[PDB]
Design a protein around this ligand. Structure first.
Ligand SMILES: [Mg+2]
Length: 198
């Protein structure tokens, strides 16, 4: 009872890139392409990882071009690491799940690093406000993208997590960061970020 149907899961495949201290790069940034990054931060104590997914949304199919995945990042430096990769991907907009750590990272990006491509649900929510409906609808959107071959997955750990991710409520941070992306794609504001500049 996986979210992604078995035949699709069986055809997923990864490019086995070297881990650069948590950063996995499948495509370099390219001129004229438009990206988005989604961030699922770990919170509190336990066995979870921070997961930043960077997706090329210039045109279909969308592509997973890089991932940052770590549970050994110093809290003091996580905003600077995210900022580095957003700047790399053509000053990438970012959509952060606003758990306690995500609220702090979003504020650091806005106030300390002065990054001005933060996707915000509202003036007081500097990212994706937590809700149950955003998870469910983001999962449905992600299922359709992967099953219709409209989102290409390259990363080994992401595929491993997709193969065990249940259709209802093992690590899942790489999938949950893709669920944030799926939810974004259902919103009116996604048209501000997707597509070539006109
Ligand atoms: Mg997490």
């Amino acid at each position: 009872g996986t979210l992604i149907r078995a035949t699709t899961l069986s055809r997923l495949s990864f490019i086995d890139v070297v881990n650069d201290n948590g950063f996995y790069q499948f495509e370099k940034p390219k001129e004229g392409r438009k990206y988005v990054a989604t961030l699922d931060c770990s919170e509190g104590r336990g066995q979870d990882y921070h997961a930043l997914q960077i997706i090329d949304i210039t045109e279909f199919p969308y592509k997973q071009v890089a991932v940052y995945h770590s549970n050994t990042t110093s809290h003091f430096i996580l905003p600077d690491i995210v900022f580095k990769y957003l700047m790399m991907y053509n000053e990438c907009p970012v959509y952060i799940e606003l758990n306690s750590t995500g609220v702090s990272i979003a504020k650091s990006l806005a106030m300390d690093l002065e990054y001005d491509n933060i996707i915000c649900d509202s003036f007081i929510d500097l990212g994706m406000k937590q809700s149950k409906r955003s998870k469910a609808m983001g999962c449905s959107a992600l299922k359709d993208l992967i099953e219709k071959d409209k989102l290409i997955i390259n990363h080994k750990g992401t595929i491993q997590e997709l193969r065990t991710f249940s259709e209802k409520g093992f690590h899942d941070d790489l999938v949950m960061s893709l669920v944030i992306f799926g939810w974004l794609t259902t919103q009116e504001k996604f048209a501000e970020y997707a597509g070539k500049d006109e």
